[PDB]
Amino acid sequence: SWEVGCGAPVPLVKCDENSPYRTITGDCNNRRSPALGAANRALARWLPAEYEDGLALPFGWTQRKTRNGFRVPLAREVSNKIVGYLDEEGVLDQNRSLLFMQWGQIVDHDLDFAPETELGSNEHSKTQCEEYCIQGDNCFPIMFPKNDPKLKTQGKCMPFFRAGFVCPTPPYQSLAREQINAVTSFLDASLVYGSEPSLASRLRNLSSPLGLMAVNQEAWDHGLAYLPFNNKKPSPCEFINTTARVPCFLAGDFRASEQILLATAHTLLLREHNRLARELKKLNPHWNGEKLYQEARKILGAFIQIITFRDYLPIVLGSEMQKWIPPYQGYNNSVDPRISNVFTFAFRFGHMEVPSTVSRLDENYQPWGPEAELPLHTLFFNTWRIIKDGGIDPLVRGLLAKKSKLMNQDKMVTSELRNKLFQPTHKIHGFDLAAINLQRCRDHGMPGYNSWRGFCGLSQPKTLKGLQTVLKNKILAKKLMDLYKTPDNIDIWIGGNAEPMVERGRVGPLLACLLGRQFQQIRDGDRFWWENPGVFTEKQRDSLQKVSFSRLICDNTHITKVPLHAFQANNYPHDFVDCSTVDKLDLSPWASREN
Numbered sequence: 001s002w003e004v005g006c007g008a009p010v011p012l013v014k015c016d017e018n019s020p021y022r023t024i025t026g027d028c029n030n031r032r033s034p035a036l037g038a039a040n041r042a043l044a045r046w047l048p049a050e051y052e053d054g055l056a057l058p059f060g061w062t063q064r065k066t067r068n069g070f071r072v073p074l075a076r077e078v079s080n081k082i083v084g085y086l087d088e089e090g091v092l093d094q095n096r097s098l099l100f101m102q103w104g105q106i107v108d109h110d111l112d113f114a115p116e117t118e119l120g121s122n123e124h125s126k127t128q129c130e131e132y133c134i135q136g137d138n139c140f141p142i143m144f145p146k147n148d149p150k151l152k153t154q155g156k157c158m159p160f161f162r163a164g165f166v167c168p169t170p171p172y173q174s175l176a177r178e179q180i181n182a183v184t185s186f187l188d189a190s191l192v193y194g195s196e197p198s199l200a201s202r203l204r205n206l207s208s209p210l211g212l213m214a215v216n217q218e219a220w221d222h223g224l225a226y227l228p229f230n231n232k233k234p235s236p237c238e239f240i241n242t243t244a245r246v247p248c249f250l251a252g253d254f255r256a257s258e259q260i261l262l263a264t265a266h267t268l269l270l271r272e273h274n275r276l277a278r279e280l281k282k283l284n285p286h287w288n289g290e291k292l293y294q295e296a297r298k299i300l301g302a303f304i305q306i307i308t309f310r311d312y313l314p315i316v317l318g319s320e321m322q323k324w325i326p327p328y329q330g331y332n333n334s335v336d337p338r339i340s341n342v343f344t345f346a347f348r349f350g351h352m353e354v355p356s357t358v359s360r361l362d363e364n365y366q367p368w369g370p371e372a373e374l375p376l377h378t379l380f381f382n383t384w385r386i387i388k389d390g391g392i393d394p395l396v397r398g399l400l401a402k403k404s405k406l407m408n409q410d411k412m413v414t415s416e417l418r419n420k421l422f423q424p425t426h427k428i429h430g431f432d433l434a435a436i437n438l439q440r441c442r443d444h445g446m447p448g449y450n451s452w453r454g455f456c457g458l459s460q461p462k463t464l465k466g467l468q469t470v471l472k473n474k475i476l477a478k479k480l481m482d483l484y485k486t487p488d489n490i491d492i493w494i495g496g497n498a499e500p501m502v503e504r505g506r507v508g509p510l511l512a513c514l515l516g517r518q519f520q521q522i523r524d525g526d527r528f529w530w531e532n533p534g535v536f537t538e539k540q541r542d543s544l545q546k547v548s549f550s551r552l553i554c555d556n557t558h559i560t561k562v563p564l565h566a567f568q569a570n571n572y573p574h575d576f577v578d579c580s581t582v583d584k585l586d587l588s589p590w591a592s593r594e595n
């Protein structure tokens, strides 16, 4: 890097080199380089940033500044002409449950968060971005093209604020701008426990010595725990229904209530922690609060690793799985475990797997009540539909029995996300996640499609006919060439997602490469990886080998009918089995006879 040692939060790291638990912040994982993979550091750059001014300004910022001699298209125009579709008939994934989409969002939240720069206080600035659509400093609004229906109902732009960056946070440094990752790069259940000391502690039950996570005190799920409420204003979850006045949940990750199924998934994970901590107490009555907390946390971290690497990545990466994530050979301390800037875009392939509706199903996996099925847009920042309309169980059934959207070159992102997205502070269900993704690519200084094709050892199409052959799609290639005049200029999110999916996977070759490398690195570069000799005992790892999502559900809801393979498409009752069929987590290897 241009000038090494520019970090604002570098010190305050007393690494206890025998401490057997992960830190919350991810510091002290790597011994030689203790900040590697820790939160609140720069995202890694696998390739040098590309900004219109070499330093900081996004391509598209200045009108008369070309990229390789062509203007970059408006993000919303690309969204409208390539990404949008009308007909939700036929879009569903006949071999992936809705859990497959949801696990992806969960894993993503474990690994990366690049928050908007801090300008939250009352001011003209953020409201003048919204109101007057005035580009400047961190305000980089998504301007509507002519012929955009939203022009007629919403104004001239959708607000957008540039991502935070390290070193000077209002002024800048002399290398290219580097965006921050606010969570730990390690797959470590940071979304459950938090990535900062403050939050980690606020989330805990330190009022009793049982090592429990705090649970909700105002509401219960047929006895089972809910996440605690986050009691700060303005609250988006209150804003979406002022009558119900039900707040957002408080979880290790800030985004937990963005949609009801993510909130759902967070609820399972918290309950798992508590069930593990109570189960541990009995087997080790002598263990204190810290000990029980840390040992539950460690088990939950392992669970997420296994589900991810054994269950999830094989049906994303398909044939490429082995090529990028060969079987584990042990911790390598030479591996950079940091999340890359490009990965935070590559893993947005999930956006094309989100379907337009969510169902609540009853115990016979039939519609729960008269509005069992709801449009996804009514479920952003929606906690009241959990609290006051059946709790978790009906939503979890729908995750099992309903299907993900299938990526489709003609039907990429459902209008529920493309046209009706809600964002805190902006008051309308009227934003476009696709447009935001594209603007964010520019904001983060992303190299274009051919740069990444080059990086990944893939052919770099220079013409329409070349692009037609790579996309295997003449009309999409044409639309991409008409908007971006060269494939060199195609934004990586749309370019990557445009490629046909590899055999037995759900992403194309380029994304398989970007994803596969990242996941290989977060495994191989993790000192606390579950299968690393020493982290667990031989017998502990024999127990952990048997975890399943199916089992998580059985332990932590009142559901009794589960598939064995929760991520594939399952129909009830054919592909469902009683919970007693399903292997448990045997915790007897954690018995410490410690006398």
Ligand code: HEM
Binding pocket: 101, 102, 103, 104, 105, 108, 112, 113, 114, 115, 258, 259, 343, 344, 345, 347, 348, 349, 350, 351, 353, 354, 417, 433, 436, 437, 440
């Ligand atoms: C209803 C479902 C979902 C909603 C509403 C949603 C919404 C969002 C929003 C608002 C952002 C912030 C975008 C920005 O300002 O740049 C975002 C970012 C992201 N989403 Fe999604 N998303 C969903 C599902 C998923 C899924 C299924 C995945 C992956 C399988 C995923 C992966 C990501 C990633 C990686 C980011 C970038 C995070 C970062 O590093 O900052 N999302 N999503």
Ligand SMILES: *[C@@H]1O[C@H](CO)[C@@H](O[C@@H]2O[C@H](CO)[C@@H](O)[C@H](O)[C@H]2NC(C)=O)[C@H](O)[C@H]1NC(C)=O
Binding pocket: 240, 241, 243, 244, 384, 388
């Ligand atoms: C806000 O939440 C309330 C409940 O907290 C929603 O509905 C209640 O909702 C339906 C009425 O259509 C029934 O369950 C009850 O008769 C209602 N009770 C109350 C307290 O009014 C209401 O529809 C929500 N509104 C929106 C726009 O989401």
Ligand SMILES: *[C@@H]1O[C@H](CO)[C@@H](O)[C@H](O)[C@H]1NC(C)=O
Binding pocket: 205, 207, 208, 210, 212, 213, 214, 215, 216, 217
């Ligand atoms: C913590 O534990 C005690 C006893 O287990 C319980 O009664 C109390 O409500 C818990 N506190 C919170 C807020 O989770």
Ligand SMILES: *[C@@H]1O[C@H](CO)[C@@H](O)[C@H](O)[C@H]1NC(C)=O
Binding pocket: 329, 332, 334, 335
């Ligand atoms: C570990 O990582 C480095 C990174 O390039 C690689 O060169 C080396 O061969 C690896 N060694 C082992 C044993 O994993």
Ligand SMILES: *[C@@H]1O[C@H](CO)[C@@H](O)[C@H](O)[C@H]1NC(C)=O
Binding pocket: 095, 315, 565, 567, 568
């Ligand atoms: C469906 O998906 C699974 C992976 O989840 C795969 O192994 C299986 O062969 C597929 N079966 C069908 C019905 O295509």
Ligand SMILES: O=N[O-]
Binding pocket: 230, 232, 233, 234, 235, 236, 248, 257
């Ligand atoms: O209350 N905040 O999501």
Ligand SMILES: O=N[O-]
Binding pocket: 255, 258
């Ligand atoms: O989940 N996104 O804020």
Ligand SMILES: [Ca+2]
Binding pocket: 110, 111, 183, 184, 185, 186, 187, 188, 189, 190, 191
């Ligand atoms: Ca993490």
